[PDB]
Ligand binder design. Structure first.
Ligand SMILES: O=C(c1ccc(O)cc1O)N1Cc2ccccc2C1
Ligand SMILES: O=C(c1ccc(O)cc1O)N1Cc2ccccc2C1
Lengths: 363, 363
């Protein structure tokens, strides 16, 4: 009773995703009027976001697309798109439409739960089956950043709808905390990382937090943010900083602490995590964000969470000494706008590359 | 009596520049046998390096190429190439050939002395005449990085030859110090920057230096390097750090110090300069390396010096707090290999861009 998936994919891929600001997410209410609006918005926007990324999947090297795990993920996206197409002709005024829609969104979220490791298995299958090559590798890197950021954005839309229209923190708006205390999230991530570090090494570095509230030096630093995303990024950073610290201090009973600075400026809210874990040579920094070498997507996915609301996550090491990691976030909810990949000529062209000598000299 | 310049440009642009390692520069002696070798090497290599970059000049937008200052720089390169062509059929066994060659290299160096600000005037002429556009701007950025790095490499070849074969430091090999004490260069750059800061602000931050010699904690850190290049980079970084510190502390008599860490690892020699000058929002970081916004090429040219021997110069700020700048150098002379742009299909393709909507969404 539905059209074939390609007809829907072609239709919806013509549209650009519509990025929302944290402010817009936050200003969305919980009434039936609001639920109907959410429904009518998402039955267009989710297909747009699904179709856009599905079109890019098809630009992957034949070698990568031919893998069973990539084909499996594709099949999930197809079914999720079709699940939403069932709602195109349904009446929002009918409460049953709305409840059925929420049920379908939950089903989609569950279906896609294992997307990250499944795609990673696809990358492994490509390497095992064909051997890796640098052109394919570059395409995979570009694609996966966009694919995973797209997924984060779809999960955000779904979580907002299901949380609001179907509880530990009643002050939250869906998954958003309008008054997220950054240092408390830092402490939560540290605590969980410490449990793991203590388990394996029977020791862990202490934590020191310093806040710099430039405009209001006395005031504890808060922001509008999705605490789970911030936690994810900090937990990954602590795990790396702790492991470095303990492993570079095999002989020591005294471990240097991990120092976190939370700075609030006019435009940025920046969080720096500094360790004395001996560092990494610059040559090896890029590999930390590579899906290929990491095939352990902790750091690249963490950086995508940062980029999702127009921030970033950057690493700067000093080999022989230690490493600084910085999460850059927008301080203002109005500047915190979804960063969404779009399928267009620019994106298509970016794939169209081939093997050749680079523009820099080798001996 | 010479062929027209285009014939020579086409001939030599077919070759790739030949990158030398710091080790190779260093192992070059000062005998007539060595001078003849230097001559026969440079009468091929300098034309190769000149031709390669001249070919790329021609890939600039018509708008930029049409400017008088860019045309002037082009004319210098043409004459310098022709100056060397006069030596193609000369006998290296003849001492007069060798002395004349050194004279010609000096003349070329002098001719090109003002290349950096002259090209900057070209960029200004393009903006004034036509107005700037983002496509042209991207092309200019890509080109200038390569153009200025090429120039650094040509100046290195010329200085090595004229210094060795025609004195404050007899232990130096041309411009190279085989035992450069990094902290002494840091202090020299600080001293000169302080003179300037004191002149304008009547105050300057103090300096603190810490060394971390990972493998040999007692030993002062030395390396094989060109001290003038290291000085250039540090002087630029101190000027920025000092200005930030004083300007962000208008009301204070007490200024936070600039802290420098020099770390020696297995592969990297890293120099971090940390200030509490209030920082810069992330959005504005890229502009610090832009030739367009800086049209003040201090930072981008400094980063090219770092990149020239396979290093880098990176900035990470915390808005509301201060800024860290890190110079990454190779610790080993064998890893310190010239990074040279090459004119090839890859480079040519990189220019071939056009106006269009990007691969990321805007609201
Ligand atoms: O320098 C880092 C590092 C990387 C990323 C990061 O976020 C923080 C960090 O300290 N590591 C060196 C090292 C040695 C042994 C084991 C793990 C690690 C990680
Ligand atoms: O944060 C920096 C900075 C940039 C680059 C750098 O290397 C070191 C730095 O501290 N600045 C802020 C500011 C305010 C007023 C005047 C100048 C400056 C430069």
């Amino acid at each position: 009773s539905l059209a074939g998936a390609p007809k829907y994919i072609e239709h919806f891929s013509k549209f650009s995703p519509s990025p929302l600001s944290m402010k817009q997410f936050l200003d969305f209410g919980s009434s039936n009027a609001c639920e109907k609006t959410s429904f009518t918005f998402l039955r267009q926007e989710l297909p747009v976001r699904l179709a856009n990324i599905m079109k890019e999947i098809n630009l992957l090297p034949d070698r990568v697309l031919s893998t069973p795990s990539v084909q499996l993920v594709q099949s999930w996206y197809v079914q999720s798109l079709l699940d939403i197409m069932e709602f195109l002709d349904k009446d929002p005024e009918d409460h049953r439409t709305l409840s059925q829609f929420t049920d379908a969104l939950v089903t989609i979220r569950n279906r896609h739960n294992d997307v990250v490791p499944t795609m990673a298995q696809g990358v492994l299958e490509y390497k095992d089956t064909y051997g890796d090559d640098p052109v394919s590798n570059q395409n995979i890197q570009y694609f996966l950043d966009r694919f995973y950021l797209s997924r984060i954005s779809i999960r955000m839309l779904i979580n907002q709808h299901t949380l609001i229209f179907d509880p530990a923190h009643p002050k939250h708006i869906g998954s958003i905390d309008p008054n997220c205390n950054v240092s408390e999230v830092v402490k939560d991530a540290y605590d969980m990382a410490k449990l793991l570090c203590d388990k394996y090494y029977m020791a862990s570095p202490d934590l020191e937090i310093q806040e710099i509230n430039a405009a209001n030096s006395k005031q504890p630093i808060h922001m509008v943010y999705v605490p789970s995303h911030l936690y994810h990024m900090l937990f990954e950073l602590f795990k790396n900083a702790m492991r470095a610290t303990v492993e570079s201090h095999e002989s020591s009973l005294i471990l240097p602490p991990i120092k976190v600075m939370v700075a609030l400026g006019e435009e940025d809210l920046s969080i720096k995590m500094s360790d004395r874990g001996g560092g990494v040579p610059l040559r090896k920094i890029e590999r930390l964000f590579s899906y290929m070498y990491s095939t352990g997507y902790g750091l690249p996915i963490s950086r995508l969470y940062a980029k999702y609301f127009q921030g970033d996550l950057q690493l700067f090491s000093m080999e022989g000494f230690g490493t600084d990691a910085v999460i850059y976030l927008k301080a203002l909810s109005t500047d915190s706008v979804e960063r969404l990949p779009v399928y267009n000529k620019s994106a298509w062209r970016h794939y169209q590359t081939i093997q050749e000598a680079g523009d820099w000299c080798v001996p």
